Amino acid sequence: SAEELLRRSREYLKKVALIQLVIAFVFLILLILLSWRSEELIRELEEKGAASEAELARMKQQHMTAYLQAALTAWEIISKSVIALLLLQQNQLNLELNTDTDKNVAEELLRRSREYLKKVALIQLVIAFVFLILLILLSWRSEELIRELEEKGAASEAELARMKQQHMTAYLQAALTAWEIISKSVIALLLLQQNQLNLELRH
Amino acid sequence: SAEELLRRSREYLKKVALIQLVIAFVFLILLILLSWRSEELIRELEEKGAASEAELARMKQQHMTAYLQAALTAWEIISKSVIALLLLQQNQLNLELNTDTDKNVAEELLRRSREYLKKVALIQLVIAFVFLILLILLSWRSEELIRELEEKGAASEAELARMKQQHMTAYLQAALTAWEIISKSVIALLLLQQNQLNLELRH
Amino acid sequence: SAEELLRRSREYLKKVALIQLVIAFVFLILLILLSWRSEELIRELEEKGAASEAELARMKQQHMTAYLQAALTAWEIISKSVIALLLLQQNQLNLELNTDTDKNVAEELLRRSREYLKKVALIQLVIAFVFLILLILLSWRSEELIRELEEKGAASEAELARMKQQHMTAYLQAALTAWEIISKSVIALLLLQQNQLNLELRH
Amino acid sequence: SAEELLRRSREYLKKVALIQLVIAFVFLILLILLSWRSEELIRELEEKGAASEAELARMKQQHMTAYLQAALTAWEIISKSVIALLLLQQNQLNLELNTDTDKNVAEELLRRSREYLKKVALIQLVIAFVFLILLILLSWRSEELIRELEEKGAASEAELARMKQQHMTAYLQAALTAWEIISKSVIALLLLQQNQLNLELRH
């Protein structure tokens, strides 16, 4: 009974992983397409003379901020779903290890588990990388927009100070969010490594 | 003593589940009612000339946004409540399986649990469906409102670009929220399936 | 060793519970005092003519909303704190029961736990009651304020519609918040009741 | 084999603790530097006459609020990170205690565990202390800014009432947020102490 039920369970877990990959794909494509439309709309307003330079700079900052917030939200979701897939794979691993008790099978299942564990760590390293590049890049652009207005006299001192303060607040918030994503992820990876050690020692 | 105590706990849980179904019903009716009242207020402002076309379109977008956010909040609560009930059913299942150890009772309890598990998965598929359809329809309405204002000249180009951008931001945020709800629900279902498999194999 | 070490832990837990009762009391008082100050500030603005009728009605609504949100927040913390103390007592109880294994001691300890569990359920029922009454009363006042402005012509039709919409939104959000708090509390209590049953059956 | 594997696992845990310490350090430096820039911008606006007295008071309040929120969030993250590390250390401790069962080794390891628990309790006491002092200071500064605007006639009665209400709200929210955080930390400290007891009783 267990071997077929485990096979069915394993196939469903793989289907779920495919669903997760599809959602991550849609998020990234949707993020990019919506961003493209926002950049094009701002470009049209600038070319049309539909907004003042200060208004355009603020809209560009709002765009960039929203872009990052969406990216961060997705990153938390993606890391959570992926780390959950790794934990779920460990539960699947244990169900199979407790059924097919052949040591040779257990070592191959454990080897596959280690490869997935490494891959997830690599995924988080990629996420941390893109976060840092995106925040650094968007921040430079935000500061450059404020400078452009200041150089041109497109905004009052209070308006410029507020843009600077609003930016710094968003920057700081992005850092808190990334901090939580990374921190939660590294703790989960260590827990998974400890679980992996016990399974290897037990087989 | 244990059997009557288990009966009382079992009956209590059934009552809790029934209460939650009633609450979810009331929420949905209340959201529909309040949404309708808003639709009527906007309709009268439009017919009466109490607001400009741009003001009315913005209010319609605010209405749709709030509607969806309430629906998403309830969906998180509903999926959490329903999956929690399923977990509570498994907890009750184990209390009885480890008391009344008759395999035939265990089989009745396990078959009922398996059916409940399938039904919850179907519930989440329905919720995900409704979310996607609702966001698509609301998105279509939002774009049409903007198109109307732009063709009529009811709003400046900067105002229209902002509505388009604000819409896209809200659209993406709604998608992210739904994805988080769906993912957590699927993970919980996988964990429950793993628990169900162990219980069936162990009895 | 454990009897004295547990004595110290038991004393600690009692001290923590007393501290939490005091803190919750202080927060209740702060909300009451802060609420008083706010109501008085609005009353004086009305008597002084420091704000228009529509603005005064809006401030009254903002006040009521903030009050309820604070009440809900405090309730969420209080129920989680009380439930955590209830869980901590079961954890402390298991440590004591497996040290002092005298059945007669276990019977007294189990009876005390059961009475506290019932008391906590009564506390949540009281909170749920208060929430429902409070939202209903605040809602009635909100509806009356909007109607007063409508009868007097204190606000444009679009402005009145916006107040009605903001009102309905806040109303529903409060209903959703209370639903989530109450349901989680009920779920936690049932899990504790199921755990209490196994512990009593084993002693 | 187990001893070398345990050594590698311990080395990784040390690395993880270093990763979290570095991120928290950098975040706190960022918080401080951005706050300093904000303060300098406000100082220039005041000296330049770029904003009214009421506008400057509001900006100072917004600054203080944002700081407190970021600081409190960072503290929450830090306390959670430390507890997570302590839990990982306890798991690591059991991996070692279940391999090297020599009571003499266990006592030295248990002595370190007790020291780490005391150290986190001291960390939380410092955080709770700083939060309270900071809340008092910032609240004091806020009240004084409002008082001066009222005496100077820099704001209308309705504007001042709103500032007082916003002040009271921010105060209570910060206090409630800190309450939840601190209470959770205290609960975690007790749970860790309960684990410390069982670890000692078993060796």
Cβ-count burial C87-115 (b if 16+ within 10 Å, e if not): bbbbebbebbbeeeeeeeebeebbeebee
Exp. method: cryo-EM
A and D touch per CB criterion (3+ pairs under 8 A): yes
Nearest to D82 by CA among D120, D25, D131: D120
What does the alpha-carbon distance between residue A97 and residue D182 come to, in Å, rounded to a whole number? 42
Residues 81-110 of C with CB under 8 A from D: 81, 84, 88, 91-92, 95
The 8-class DSSP code of residue A13 comes to H
Cβ-count burial C11-40 (b if 16+ within 10 Å, e if not): ebbeebbeebeebbeebeebbeebbeebee
Q: Which residues of A touch D27 (CB under 8 A)?
A: 175-176, 179
Nearest to C203 by CA among B2, D201, D191, B10: B2
D49: left (phi over 0), alpha (psi -120 to 50) or beta: left
Please give the distance of CA A78 from its chain centroid, rounded to a whole number: 5
Q: Say how many Å lie between the first and final Cα of chain B, rounded.
A: 23
**DSSP secondary structure, chain C, as one string:** -HHHHHHHHHHHHHHHHHHHHHHHHHHHHHHHHHHHHHHHHHHHHHHHT-S-HHHHHHHHHHHHHHHHHHHHHHHHHHHHHHHHHHHHHHHHHHHHHTTS--HHHHHHHHHHHHHHHHHHHHHHHHHHHHHHHHHHHHHHHHHHHHHHHHHHT-S-HHHHHHHHHHHHHHHHHHHHHHHHHHHHHHHHHHHHHHHHHHHHHT-
Q: Is the Cα torsion angle B170, B174, B179, B180 positive or negative in sign?
A: positive
Neighbours of B139 (CB within 10 A): 17
Token pair of C54 as six digits: 């529509």
Query: Which residue is it, tokens 């070592």?
Result: A107
What does the alpha-carbon distance between residue B193 and residue B86 come to, in Å, rounded to a whole number? 11
- CB-CB contact of A68 with A167 (8 Å): no
A and C touch per CB criterion (3+ pairs under 8 A): no
Residues 6+ apart with CB under 8 A from C113: C89, C90, C93, C196
Q: CB-side exposure of D13: number of CA atoms within 13 Å?
A: 22
Over its C-alpha atoms, chain A yields an Rg (Å, rounded) of 23
The 8-class DSSP code of residue D101 comes to -
What does the alpha-carbon distance between residue C63 and residue B26 come to, in Å, rounded to a whole number? 27
Residues 6+ apart with CB under 8 A from A105: A96
Inter-chain contact C16–D193, Cβ cutoff 8 Å?
no
Residues 6+ apart with CB under 8 A from B109: B93, B96, B97
Between CA B188 and CA B192, with CA B189 as vertex, the angle to 5 degrees is 85
Token pair of C163 as six digits: 């107040």
Q: Does C187 touch chain B (CB under 8 A)?
A: yes
What does the alpha-carbon distance between residue A60 and residue A64 come to, in Å, rounded to a whole number? 6
What does the alpha-carbon distance between residue C143 and residue A123 come to, in Å, rounded to a whole number? 53
Please give the distance of CA D164 from its chain centroid, rounded to a whole number: 27
Q: Which residues of A touch B173 (CB under 8 A)?
A: 70, 73
Inter-chain contact C165–B41, Cβ cutoff 8 Å?
yes
What does the alpha-carbon distance between residue C147 and residue A116 come to, in Å, rounded to a whole number? 63
Of the partner residues D156, D173, D190, the one whose CB lies closest to the CB of residue C13? D190
Neighbours of A8 (CB within 10 A): 12
Secondary structure class of B1 (helix, strand, coil): coil
Neighbours of D63 (CB within 10 A): 18
- CB-CB contact of D172 with C70 (8 Å): yes
Which chain C residue is nearest to residue B59, measuring alpha carbons? Answer: C162
Q: Does A198 touch chain D (CB under 8 A)?
A: yes
Query: H-helix or E-strand containing D117?
Result: helix D103-152
Token pair of C122 as six digits: 């009564």
**C-alpha pair distances (Å), A40 with each of A44, A45, C145, D194:** 6, 9, 45, 60
Q: Which residues of D touch A175 (CB under 8 A)?
A: 27, 30
Inter-chain contact B161–A45, Cβ cutoff 8 Å?
yes
**C-alpha pair distances (Å), D156 with each of B106, C44, C48:** 73, 13, 11
- CB-CB contact of D2 with A201 (8 Å): yes
Chain C interface disruption, residue of B15, B73, B177, most C CBs within 10 A: B73
Nearest to A16 by CA among B189, C55, C3, B126: B189
A14: left (phi over 0), alpha (psi -120 to 50) or beta: alpha
State the chains in contact with A (3 or more Cβ–Cβ pairs under 8 Å).
B, D
Cβ-count burial C174-202 (b if 16+ within 10 Å, e if not): bbbbbbbbbbbbbbbbbbbbbbbbebbee
Residues 6+ apart with CB under 8 A from B161: A41, A42, A44, A45, A50, A59
Q: Does C66 touch chain B (CB under 8 A)?
A: no
**DSSP secondary structure, A38-76, as one string:** HHHHHHHHHHHT-S-HHHHHHHHHHHHHHHHHHHHHHHH
- CB-CB contact of C63 with C39 (8 Å): yes
What does the alpha-carbon distance between residue A91 and residue B191 come to, in Å, rounded to a whole number? 8
Inter-chain contact B34–C171, Cβ cutoff 8 Å?
yes
Residues 6+ apart with CB under 8 A from C131: C71, C72, C75, C174, C178, C182
Please give the distance of CA B49 from its chain centroid, rounded to a whole number: 36
Token pair of A14 as six digits: 């793989």
Token pair of D45 as six digits: 């606006």
Q: Is the Cα torsion angle A50, A54, A60, A66 positive or negative in sign?
A: negative
Nearest to A107 by CA among A118, A117, A96: A96
Q: Which residues of B touch C168 (CB under 8 A)?
A: 34, 37-38
**DSSP secondary structure, C155-188, as one string:** S-HHHHHHHHHHHHHHHHHHHHHHHHHHHHHHHH
Query: Which residue is it, tokens 């959201």?
Result: B31
Neighbours of B122 (CB within 10 A): 10
Q: Does C125 touch chain B (CB under 8 A)?
A: no
Cα dihedral B87/B93/B98/B103 (nearest 10): -140
What does the alpha-carbon distance between residue A17 and residue A86 come to, in Å, rounded to a whole number? 10
Which chain A residue is nearest to residue D81, measuring alpha carbons? Answer: A183
- CB-CB contact of A163 with A155 (8 Å): yes
What does the alpha-carbon distance between residue D106 and residue A77 come to, in Å, rounded to a whole number? 40
Which chain B residue is nearest to residue C186, measuring alpha carbons? Answer: B16
- Amino acid of residue B195: N
Nearest to B171 by CA among D172, A38, C101: A38
Nearest to C156 by CA among B159, B61, B146, B55: B55
Inter-chain contact C173–B44, Cβ cutoff 8 Å?
no
What does the alpha-carbon distance between residue D169 and residue D163 come to, in Å, rounded to a whole number? 10
What does the alpha-carbon distance between residue A142 and residue A167 come to, in Å, rounded to a whole number? 7
Please give the distance of CA A199 from its chain centroid, rounded to a whole number: 30
Q: Which residues of B touch C175 (CB under 8 A)?
A: 27, 30
What does the alpha-carbon distance between residue C174 and residue C182 come to, in Å, rounded to a whole number? 12
What values do phi and psi take at D49, rounded to 5?
A: 80, 30
Nearest to D95 by CA among D15, D198, D10, D202: D10
Inter-chain contact C27–D176, Cβ cutoff 8 Å?
yes
Neighbours of B34 (CB within 10 A): 22
Task: State how far residue B85 is from chain C, nearest Cα, in angstroms.
Answer: 8
Inter-chain contact C156–B50, Cβ cutoff 8 Å?
yes
Largest CA distance in chain A: 77
The 8-class DSSP code of residue B102 comes to -
Inter-chain contact C158–B51, Cβ cutoff 8 Å?
yes
Query: Which residue is it, tokens 């008083």?
Result: C36
- CB-CB contact of B45 with B62 (8 Å): no
The resolution, in Å, is 5.9
Task: State how far residue B187 is from chain A, nearest Cα, in angstroms.
Answer: 7
What values do phi and psi take at D177, rounded to 5?
A: -65, -45
The 8-class DSSP code of residue D155 comes to S
Q: Which residues of B touch A77 (CB under 8 A)?
A: 176, 179-180, 183
State the chains in contact with D (3 or more Cβ–Cβ pairs under 8 Å).
A, C
Residues 6+ apart with CB under 8 A from B105: B96
Q: Say how many Å lie between the first and final Cα of chain D, rounded.
A: 23
- CB-CB contact of A149 with A53 (8 Å): yes
